[PDB]
Write an enzyme that holds these catalytic residues in place. Structure first.
Site, PDB file in Angstrom:
ATOM      1  CG  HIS A 138      -0.297  -0.256   2.364  1.00 47.23           C
ATOM      2  ND1 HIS A 138       0.023   0.961   3.117  1.00 47.23           N
ATOM      3  CD2 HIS A 138      -0.498  -1.251   3.196  1.00 47.23           C
ATOM      4  CE1 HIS A 138       0.271   0.522   4.537  1.00 47.23           C
ATOM      5  NE2 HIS A 138       0.163  -0.661   4.560  1.00 47.23           N
ATOM      6  CG  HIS A 155       2.589  10.378   6.846  1.00 51.16           C
ATOM      7  ND1 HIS A 155       1.441   9.788   6.666  1.00 51.16           N
ATOM      8  CD2 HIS A 155       2.112  11.790   6.952  1.00 51.16           C
ATOM      9  CE1 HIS A 155       0.500  10.745   6.421  1.00 51.16           C
ATOM     10  NE2 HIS A 155       0.906  11.851   6.401  1.00 51.16           N
ATOM     11  CB  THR A 200      -3.244   2.626   6.812  1.00 50.92           C
ATOM     12  OG1 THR A 200      -2.403   2.781   7.893  1.00 50.92           O
ATOM     13  CG2 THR A 200      -2.848   3.195   5.409  1.00 50.92           C
TER      14      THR A 200
HETATM   15  O1  SHH Z   1      -1.369   5.854   9.338  1.00 50.27           O
HETATM   16  C1  SHH Z   1      -0.422   6.668   8.879  1.00 50.27           C
HETATM   17  C2  SHH Z   1       0.514   7.120   9.795  1.00 50.27           C
HETATM   18  C3  SHH Z   1       1.132   6.146  10.862  1.00 50.27           C
HETATM   19  C4  SHH Z   1       1.562   4.921  10.306  1.00 50.27           C
HETATM   20  C5  SHH Z   1       2.329   4.096  11.177  1.00 50.27           C
HETATM   21  C6  SHH Z   1       2.760   2.840  10.408  1.00 50.27           C
HETATM   22  C7  SHH Z   1       1.917   1.935  10.160  1.00 50.27           C
HETATM   23  C8  SHH Z   1       1.612   0.608  11.021  1.00 50.27           C
HETATM   24  O2  SHH Z   1       2.679  -0.014  11.516  1.00 50.27           O
HETATM   25  N1  SHH Z   1       0.344   0.283  11.111  1.00 50.27           N
HETATM   26  C9  SHH Z   1       0.018  -0.921  11.954  1.00 50.27           C
HETATM   27  C10 SHH Z   1      -0.229  -0.389  13.280  1.00 50.27           C
HETATM   28  C11 SHH Z   1      -0.526  -1.364  14.215  1.00 50.27           C
HETATM   29  C12 SHH Z   1      -1.084  -2.758  13.642  1.00 50.27           C
HETATM   30  C13 SHH Z   1      -0.966  -2.927  12.206  1.00 50.27           C
HETATM   31  C14 SHH Z   1      -0.615  -2.084  11.473  1.00 50.27           C
HETATM   32  N2  SHH Z   1      -0.367   6.592   7.622  1.00 50.27           N
HETATM   33  O3  SHH Z   1      -1.173   6.174   6.756  1.00 50.27           O
HETATM   34 ZN    ZN Z   2       0.999   7.536   6.335  1.00 51.11          ZN
END
Ligand code: SHH
Ligand code: ZN
Length: 257
Positions: free
Chosen positions: A61, A116, A196
């Site tokens: 993504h 980000h 996301t």
């Molecule tokens: O959401 C954001 C900004 C912060 C993103 C942080 C990293 C994504 C990530 O690790 N997501 C996640 C967290 C917990 C469980 C599963 C996925 N941008 O899309």
């Molecule tokens: Zn992001």
């Protein structure tokens, strides 16, 4: 599974992730005339001189540049934050056309992309614990506008051919994220969420006022990546942004007048 297509995109996410309709969702539109100047806000402290990048990954993504976060090498402090937040990774969101792509908007204006820089609060010990806390993450958001090329971005652009499809990774050492910062560190801040799934409400957002400029050729190369894995039908990785969500009972604060 979730994505950015017509059948699995942001308007569908609430069926698997009901927090999508929650009280502190991101991104939001920043209304510059309604944001409140807060003199108690401190300047940001960005300490990236010891950053150790490791790898770049197409996760299906976006593409993430990952850093060693086993020590206080690259940290964010100050601003609205209490304590020390370690840099773990950065990624971008971008559009199919230059007039869209950012997640946050400023007076309804969309930028071509948004960077980000993701940091986690070290008091929680690991990233997986931090995302379960209302003050677990701090994300620095930087807008990209199309104009002159950004020299510090070119090393990222040149490796994208090697991670075209989902699941591909490449070694990516000695990258200095200071080359992605604007001149000024003036910012807006508000409490929000991941943009996301799982959309957890664990983020202090710090959105910089000054965009960085990138060239048309640089952003065109983002648009050649693929959402799909190798050997699957080609779907270009474009428009991986979530639209703005209701501000609800939140105030956006500004570090500047
Ligand atoms: O959401 C954001 C900004 C912060 C993103 C942080 C990293 C994504 C990530 O690790 N997501 C996640 C967290 C917990 C469980 C599963 C996925 N941008 O899309
Ligand atoms: Zn992001």
């Amino acid at each position: 599974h979730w994505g950015y297509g017509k059948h699995n995109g942001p308007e569908h996410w609430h069926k698997d992730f009901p927090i999508a309709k929650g009280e502190r969702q991101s991104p939001v539109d920043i209304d510059t005339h309604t944001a409140k100047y807060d003199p108690s806000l401190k300047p940001l402290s960005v300490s990236y001189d010891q950053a150790t990048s490791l790898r770049i990954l197409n996760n299906g993504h976006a593409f993430n540049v990952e850093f060693d976060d086993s020590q206080d090498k690259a940290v964010l402090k100050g601003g609205p934050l209490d304590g020390t937040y370690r840099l773990i990774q950065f990624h971008f969101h971008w559009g199919s056309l230059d007039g869209q792509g950012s997640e946050h908007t400023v007076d309804k204006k969309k930028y071509a992309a948004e960077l980000h820089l993701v940091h986690w609060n070290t008091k929680y010990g690991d990233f997986g614990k931090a995302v379960q806390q209302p003050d677990g993450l701090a994300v620095l958001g930087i807008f990209l506008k199309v104009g002159s090329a950004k020299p510090g971005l070119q090393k990222v652009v040149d490796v994208l051919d090697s991670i075209k499809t989902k699941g591909k990774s490449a070694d990516f050492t000695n990258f200095d994220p200071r080359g992605l910062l604007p001149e000024s560190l003036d910012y807006w801040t508000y409490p929000g969420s991941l943009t996301t799934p799982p959309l957890l409400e664990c983020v202090t957002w710090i959105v910089l006022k000054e965009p960085i400029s990138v060239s048309s050729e640089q952003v065109l190369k983002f648009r050649k990546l693929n959402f799909n894995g190798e050997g699957e039908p080609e779907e270009l990785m474009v428009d991986n942004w979530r639209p703005a969500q209701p501000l609800k009972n939140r105030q956006i604060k500004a570090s500047f007048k």
